[PDB]
Amino acid sequence: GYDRALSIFSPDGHIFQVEYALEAVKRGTCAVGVKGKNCVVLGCERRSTLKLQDTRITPSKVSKIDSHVVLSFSGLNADSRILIEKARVEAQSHRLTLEDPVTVEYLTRYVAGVQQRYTQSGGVR
Amino acid sequence: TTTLAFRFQGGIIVAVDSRATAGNWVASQTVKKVIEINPFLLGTMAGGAADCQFWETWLGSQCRLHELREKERISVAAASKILSNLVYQYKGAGLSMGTMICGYTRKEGPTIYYVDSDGTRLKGDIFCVGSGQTFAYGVLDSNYKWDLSVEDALYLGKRSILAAAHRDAYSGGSVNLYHVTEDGWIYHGNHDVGELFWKVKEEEGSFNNVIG
Amino acid sequence: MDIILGIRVQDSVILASSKAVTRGISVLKDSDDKTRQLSPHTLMSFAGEAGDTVQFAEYIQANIQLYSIREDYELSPQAVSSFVRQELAKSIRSRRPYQVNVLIGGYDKKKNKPELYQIDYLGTKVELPYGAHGYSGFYTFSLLDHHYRPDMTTEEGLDLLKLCVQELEKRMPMDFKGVIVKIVDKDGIRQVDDF
Amino acid sequence: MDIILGIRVQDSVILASSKAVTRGISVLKDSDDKTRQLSPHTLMSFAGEAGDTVQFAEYIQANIQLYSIREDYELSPQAVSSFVRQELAKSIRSRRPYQVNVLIGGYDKKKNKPELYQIDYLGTKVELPYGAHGYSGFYTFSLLDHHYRPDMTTEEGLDLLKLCVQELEKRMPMDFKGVIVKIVDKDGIRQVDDF
Amino acid sequence: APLX
Amino acid sequence: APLX
Amino acid sequence: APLX
Amino acid sequence: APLX
Amino acid sequence: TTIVGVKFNNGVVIAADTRSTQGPIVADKNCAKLHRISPKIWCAGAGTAADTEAVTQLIGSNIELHSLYTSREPRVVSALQMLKQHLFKYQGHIGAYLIVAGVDPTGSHLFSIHAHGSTDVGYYLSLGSGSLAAMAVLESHWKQDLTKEEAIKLASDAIQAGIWNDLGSGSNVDVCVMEIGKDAEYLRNYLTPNVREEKQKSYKFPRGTTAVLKESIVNICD
Amino acid sequence: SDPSSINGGIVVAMTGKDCVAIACDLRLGSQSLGVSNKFEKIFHYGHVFLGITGLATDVTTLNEMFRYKTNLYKLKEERAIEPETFTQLVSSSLYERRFGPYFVGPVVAGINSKSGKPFIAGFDLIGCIDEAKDFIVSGTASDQLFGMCESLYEPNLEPEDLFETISQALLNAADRDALSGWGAVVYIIKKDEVVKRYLKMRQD
Amino acid sequence: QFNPYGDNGGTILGIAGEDFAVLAGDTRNITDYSINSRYEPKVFDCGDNIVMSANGFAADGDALVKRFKNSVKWYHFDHNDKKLSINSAARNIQHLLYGKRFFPYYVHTIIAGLDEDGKGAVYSFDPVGSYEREQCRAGGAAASLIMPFLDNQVNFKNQYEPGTNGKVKKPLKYLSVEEVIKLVRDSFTSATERHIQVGDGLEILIVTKDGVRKEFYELKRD
Amino acid sequence: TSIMAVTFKDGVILGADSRTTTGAYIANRVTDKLTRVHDKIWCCRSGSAADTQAIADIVQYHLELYTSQYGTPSTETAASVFKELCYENKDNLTAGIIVAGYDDKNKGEVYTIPLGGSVHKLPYAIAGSGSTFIYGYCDKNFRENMSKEETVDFIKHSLSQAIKWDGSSGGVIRMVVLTAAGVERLIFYPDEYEQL
Amino acid sequence: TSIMAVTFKDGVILGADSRTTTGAYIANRVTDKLTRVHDKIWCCRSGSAADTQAIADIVQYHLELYTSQYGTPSTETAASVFKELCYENKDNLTAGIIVAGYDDKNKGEVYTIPLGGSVHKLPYAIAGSGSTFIYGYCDKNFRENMSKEETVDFIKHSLSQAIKWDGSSGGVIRMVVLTAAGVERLIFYPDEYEQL
Amino acid sequence: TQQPIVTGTSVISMKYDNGVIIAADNLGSYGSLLRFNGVERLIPVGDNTVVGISGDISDMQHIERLLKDLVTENAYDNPLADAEEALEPSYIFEYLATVMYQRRSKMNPLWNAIIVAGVQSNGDQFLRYVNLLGVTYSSPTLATGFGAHMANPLLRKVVDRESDIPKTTVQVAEEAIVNAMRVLYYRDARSSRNFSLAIIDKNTGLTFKKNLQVENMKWDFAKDIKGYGTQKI
Ligand SMILES: [Cl-]
Ligand SMILES: [Cl-]
Ligand SMILES: [Mg+2]
Ligand SMILES: [Mg+2]
Ligand SMILES: [Mg+2]
Ligand SMILES: [Mg+2]
DSSP, X not given: OOOOOOSOOOTTSOOHXXXXXXXXXXXXXXXXXXXXXXXXXXXXXXXXXXXXXXXXTSOOSSEEEETTEEEOOOSOHHHHHHHHHHHHHHHHHHHHHHSSOOOHHHHXXXXXXXXXXXXXXXXXX | OOEEEEEEXXXXXXXXXXXXXXXXXXXXXXXXXXXXXXXXXXXXXOBBHHHHHHXXXXXHHHHHHHHHHHSSOOOHHHHHHHXXXXXXXXXXXXXXXXXXXXXXXXXXXXXXXXXXXXXXXXEOSEEEESTXXXXXXXXXXHHOOTXXXXXXXXXXXXXXHHHHHHHBTTOOSEEEEXXXXXXXXXXXXXXXXXXXXXXXXXXXXXXXXXXX | OOOEEEEEOSSEEEEEEEOOEEETXXXXXXXXXXXXXXXXXEEEEEEESTTHHHHHHXXXXXXXXXXXXXHTSOOOHHHHHHHHHHHHHHHTTSSSOOOXXXXXXXXXXXXXXXXXXXXXXXXXXXXXXEEEEGGGHHHHHHHHHHHOOTTOOHHHHHHHHHHHHHHHHHHOSBOOOOEEEEEXXXXXXXXXXXO | OOOEEEEEXXXXXXXXEEOOEEETTEEEESOOOOEEEXXXXXXXXXXXXXXXXXXXXXXXXXXXXXXXXXXTSOOOHXXXXXXXXXHHHHHTXXXXXXXXXXXXXXXXXXXXXXXXXXXXXXXXXXXXXXXXXXXXXXXXXXXXXHHOOTTOOHHHHHHXXXXXXXXXXXXXXXXXXXXXXXEEETTEEEEESOO | XXXX | XXXX | XXXX | OOXX | OOEEEEEETTEEEEEEOOXXXXXXXXXXXXXXXXXXXXXXXXXXXXXXXXXXXXXXXXXXXXXXXXXXXXXXXXOHHHXXXXXXXXXXXXXXXXXXXXXXXXEEXXXXXXXXXXXXXXXXXXSEEEESTTHHHHHHHHHHHOOSSOOHHHHXXXXXXHHXXXXXXXXXXXXXXXXXXXXXXXXXXXXXXXXXXXXXXXXXXXXXXXXXXXXXXXXXXXXXXO | OOGGGSSOOEEEEEEETTXXXXXXEOOXXXXXXXXXXXXXXXXXXXXXXXXXXXXXXXXXXXXXXXXXXXXXXHXXXXXXXXXXXXXXXXXXXXXXXXTSOOOEEXXXXXXXXXXXXXXXXXXXXXXXXXEOSSEEEEETTHXXXXXXXXXXXXXXXXHHHHXXXXXXXXXXHHTTBTTSOSOEEEEEEETTEEEEEEEOOOOO | OOOOOOOOOOEEEEEEOSSOEEEEEEOOXXXXXXXXXXXXXXXEEOXXXXXXXXXXXXXXXXXXXXXXXXXXXXXXXXXXTOOXXXXXXXHHHHHHHHTTTTSOOOEEEXXXXXXXXXXXXXXXXXXXXXXXXXXXXXXXXXXXXXXXXXXXXXXXXXXXXXXXXXXXXXXXXXXXXXXXXXXXXXXXXXXXXXXXXXXXXXXXXXXXXXXXXXXXEEOXXX | OOEEEEEETTEEEEEEOOOEESSSBXXXXXXXXXXXXXXXXXXXXXXXXXHHHHHHHHHHHHHHHHHHHHXXXXXXXXXXXXXXXXXXXXXXXXXXXXXXXXXXXXXXXXXXXXXXXXXXXESEEEESGGGGGGHHXXXXXXXXXXXXXXXXXXXXXXXXXXXXXXXXXXXXXXXXXXXXXXXXXXXEOHHHHTTO | OOEEEEEETTEEEXXXXXXXXXXXXXXXXXXXXXXXXXXXXXXXXXXXXHHHHHHHHHHHHHHHHHHHHHSSOOHHHHXXXXXXXXHHTTTTOOEEEEEEEEOXXXXXXXXXEOTTOOOEEESEEEESGGGGGGHHHHHHHOOTTOOHHHHHHHHHHHHHHHHHXXXXXXXXXXXXXXXXXXXXXXXXXXXXXXXX | OOOOOEEEOOEEEEEETTEEEEEEEOOEEETTEEEESOOOOEEEOTTSEEEEEEEEHHHHHHHHHHHHHHHHHHHTTOTTTTTTTXXXXXXXXXXXXXXXXXXXXXXXXXXXXXXXXXXXXTSOXXXXXXXXXXXXXXXXEEEOTHHXXXXXXXXXXXXXXXXXXXXXXXXXXXXXXXXXXXXXXXXXXXXXXXXXEEEEETTTEEEEEEEEEOOSOOOGGGGGOOSSSSOOO
């Protein structure tokens, strides 16, 4: 297997590959979340250098993970599909074994854990 | 073995005998067939002594890790399903277990799950499990009401194990009793059949089949 | 076959016996009387291997009736039970043994006592306050250990029996299609028609 | 497990499934729901080897629900049935195969038709007007061959089902403790509460 | 091994 | 049966 | 048994 | 099978 | 079991241990495996306990009747023939393994009989589970021209090998000496090298220890 | 499928100073199911006592058989059969059924009424006599009885002491066997009075 | 067909007093009807005031004891020389046994020592790791002979207070080490009398807060 | 067992080892497998010890009764009586028997009766487990009309080899000589025959 | 099969019958059971034809590779390679093999490898079903340091007898002679060897 | 899962005051065929240990190779290989016992019974047994096969307990061993007359005697045995 340690420490104690991943987020379209007294709202900018788009079929930016939880993002779009799939699978697996849908905190902790794993595993960015 | 657990007005009663046998050889009369998993969770043992003991104390460790990770006590449903999913992985290998997972949570109320080594998992109000289950059922069913007082419920559970201990050659020793409420489980003592039978015969006037 | 029970109370013996006759995945009959009158104060219920049961019961009945005619006298329940036991005890070492279990309920008129005998196909005889054959005993013995009293009336006995049938209908895997109940007392043998 | 039936009428699929759970000589439970909702317009009943049945049903349910979330769309009954068949067809050559038989009843909203699929543990799939697994079929298929009409209403379907349950309660050796009935139609899945 |  |  |  |  | 037979100068001697087993359990610590067929013909038996007793009594009975009918003292070869033909008829199912010995008008004789009905002649023999331990001793110490006292020692030494080294044999040594012109002498418990040591404690209970429900006088009379 | 342990039960016998004791439990079951609590396994023919363990149908049959044989013996001989003689009759009768035996473990106890000697014996199912000074054991808890007897027993006990010893051997053996127990009876037998005591024991 | 198990016989026995515990076992080792050795110890000092015997199939017994001794060694290495309490040993042994659930050690295991309050403790295990603390346990071939004797003499079962009408039980009480060694010695001589696989010698390991002492006694060699 | 019978100039000689086996245990190391059924008709026994003894006893009885009524039986007649027993009871018998006798008309004769109860008249015969190892040797070394000393040597050398290779054979070599001169018993011990 | 190998003055000779059996049917009456694994190391094969061929092919391959790297292997080395195969695969193999070769240092050598894969160095060796019948003969007639002609006769006479009694042996007698002079193949037909 | 083919019968042994004796015949049987006659079943390891083996000979030869490789391995980087770090009998035994039990645990045993006889460096006698099941035991006398049944009772007459060892000389003990070998030749149908014997003495070291023979046999009484019961001539 391809093994290279791509996420490593620099002399100042920074992990440049993680920090450069943040730069990719910075370049992404804006996303905002605001929670009311009794609701949560997810707003997302869509960059408007694109007409002739087909909005029926173009991947929407807010994704249902389960029927009670949604996830939105900024950054690399292809990367976000991988996290959403993993999150969706975990949501179903949690229901299967715990007989209860995920808490929002639990599902967040899972996605976060996946992201962390990719910062200290060989061969992956 | 004879073990039972039933739901009622005042929570859950759990009662078990204490005999272990190897064929007709009585190996022990002092087995603890109830395992105290946490202050709100009980597991009963029937089948292979080692299988039950090992995997039910293993279950306790898994429930402990749940509450460390999730900052919350595990649901009876989830605890029972850990055990049942475990034994299902071993299906065909020859594990022998008939267990009941008994407990209270705020989200569930008082709850009993029957879990066995074929991988059967059932929620229910009344179960009896073991070689003496039918004897226990006979007494239990014919006196059971949802509205039994805590006092009556405790006695019925105790009396049902006694019935089975008497008729079933592979049940005996002593009765162990538990009551489970919204505040957790409460132990209601170890009762040797040696003295309990004669006490019940006298006070209740039952067991006339027996030379008094 | 399957379910046969018996309870002896103060002044009578009550026999309850299931009505179903099942072969394969079909209940062929739901009104089968699994009993033979041996003499006017002796009744025998039976369960076991198909064919063997009735053949055995009728054979005993024929022998007891012959004795009655010969001596112009009714054999005591104890005597009939001993005769039956010996027949089964011979049978168990035959080329093909009778696979039949029986309950013999009788009122002994010399003693003025009801008597219940439980005999299995090996010829194992025991006199009991209450009895059962097959899987039935696994529910009823414990139940009866609890609720039975030696001095019960015939009516108390029937209520006690209702408890047994109720439990069996709750926990038994099979549909045995209810029971036919019969009472043996000082006035002979009669059948309860609504159970 | 044991009894699972299904009838497809004009505008719905009706599934009837026995409530008893028996192990040894004890009926452990008389209110067991032998069914899982796979999607809002698809229902699956199941019977077979202890443990295997629920493990299989829940596993399929988890997979179908995952698909629904991923595509924000409901898979057609035909598609779900084919997925299920493939899973069983793989299983039959595994180290330890799932010994589970299923009926899949669904309302296809694109076609506006109810559909009933019968699939056994080998992965043998067939679409039917009415179906059954186990010994149940030996009484119901002939009965339904007689009384069933393709254009029946949901109410006519339930009466037809009463006939099937009545026959099974008359002739089946075991007490299966009645059935839970569920209707799948254009408005989803609901349960009849007095049967 | 013993059973219970 | 006892042996010798 | 003894053989020869 | 062939033997020698 | 362990059993042996040894010939000497003027007769023959047989010996046996005294243990009976029912699986690993010792059923009898002091049973008699030496049987009298006739006054001067004795039998040692191994195998199924009831079979050796029953077959030995039956042939002993018929030998007595035969002795009366013929007005002669019974011969060992008659016991031998009757035993072997009986055992052969039963195809091994009568599990009797016997060393037959005695004196008669013809002389002194020593034979063994296996359960399927074959017989052997020899100056020294052993049968039973302990037969190899015993035979090791016999093969080591037997000689031609033994005196009566040498033969007794050799026989009981062979039984002792069985007692100590075979788990199927234990307790005591029985002997029987059949000398020509003399009465057979049956030496029951000739050796007793396995006396139970004094127990550490007396387990005699305080009277009234046992809980009683009922008493009654039993009528043994008429 | 092992006929000697379908019904369960035990019998033990002991000698004392000018007395014998013989005791049995009262259980009759069908494998795990206890059926009767009143099934005695000790019978007597005049002053000779016979206990029988094993298959209950054979226990009953053999009792009926030995009653028959001893009744005829008495009529022809004009005296009660003695224990030494009865022991021989038991042996003959069992071995007569050598290749289709009664599945029983009989035990004989009594006092010879001429010589005054206490006498006990035990048999295997095919008639082998085990005569003993001290004790004979029989039944599904025979291992336990052997252990209890071999440690508890001492020679020359007085009848009321012998009673305690045999009772404790029976009770504690029965409690380690699933198929024995459910009550117990002890016969104390002296040259011409016989006391019969029912023991209180655990009913599980 | 190759059978990976054998049976080496012998028997073991553990009794616990108030401030001591004993673990005894005979020293005979057998296969079938042969004696392999008259002195082959099977009770072991395992360190940390724990004695252990694993009786049945000797090869499995030795493997297990070896593994547990080794377990004690690493417990010290990994947890700063901490003392392995008897309750912790017991649980560790459960995992050793159950780890071979599907190819078991054919042994009945007993360990003895002192609990954390200095009281005597005996733990016993079935072959696949079910375990339980007791005052009292016999294991191995003669277990069924000895155990009911111990119920009667150690826990005073079926024993009542004379003249209390079988209403007041004999009251429970700890035994002196002198009393316990008497019950052990009598248990084994009785077992030796009636079980063919038990005999030759008896070795007792006594465990107090001052360590492990041994005592040895001759047993009948037949 | 190893057994054989050989015809020669003056009659016939029977030979046998002396080992009885009960597993791998030697139950008897000095067995006499050469058995008289008439003055000058003898047999060698192999197979079951019980079967062959029971058979020989019956045959001896028949020939004693034959003698009483019709005089001395021929060797052929004796072999016929063995056959009748072995053949008719072939399901229940494990008996391999060689019959050998001396007439004054017929001189020496050998009949071998293997397991099935067939009869085979031969110049010489070998049988028993140990015989397999000496088919080669015996076929190469046997001639007709050998002298007594040559025949004793042939048997001694043959059985020596059978005993050497067969674990189920051993002890002493016994022989029985059958001529007009009467009946002679020979015995040869290991220290002699082993180093041949 | 009947096979053997015999050491003598100038080296070693291997011999074998030519019968392959497939039941009681003779599948091949002219089989070559003598097989080359190196110029002057040969083997006799008995047991399964498939097993022994597969084994010999592997051994030939090992010794060819041995030769390339370290020169001529000893007969002992060749026998060791056979053993390794037979021993390690004892559950799946039915192969009774005799290995024979000629060194110039060691002269003639014979190693026999029976079913379990044990190794036994001997002056001569016999094996195969037919060998049972000639243990007697061969033990009586073998001497050390025979001449070539004596050794050919010994093998011819021995296998003649094995073939005569064993139904699983027959056809021609093949031999392979191994000396300093090279390698010689001999064959003898029934009409010659039968009437020996 | 195995079945033994070429086999060796009994190995017998005992301790005496100064050392240990061990013996075993030179036969390799093939069922009832006494196939091979020059088979050495005692294998010396160093000059302080003899390992005697019964059972399957192919597995014995495998074990020979293990022991000979063990000696080699022990010499590696070991300047005290022929002194303080020489292989002891207890090392050789434990190694074999370890292997035997592992092979039984893999359901593929070495089909042997083994006795390791020798003298430890402190002068102590070593005698221990191990077999295909990995069962091990020590006794003043040890034997395998028929030896266990026939030799042990004879050898225990000499050394019946620990205390009897100081009282037993090498002449006495060799006599007992040699006599035991004769008995086995009388009675074991798979024994041979030829055998090897080895003494390991704490003073004289290892004496290995080859080509011994059973002698002084009693066969004469055979002539007096006629028939099987009633026959006279
Ligand atoms: Cl013979
Ligand atoms: Cl080929
Ligand atoms: Mg009970
Ligand atoms: Mg009990
Ligand atoms: Mg003993
Ligand atoms: Mg030989």
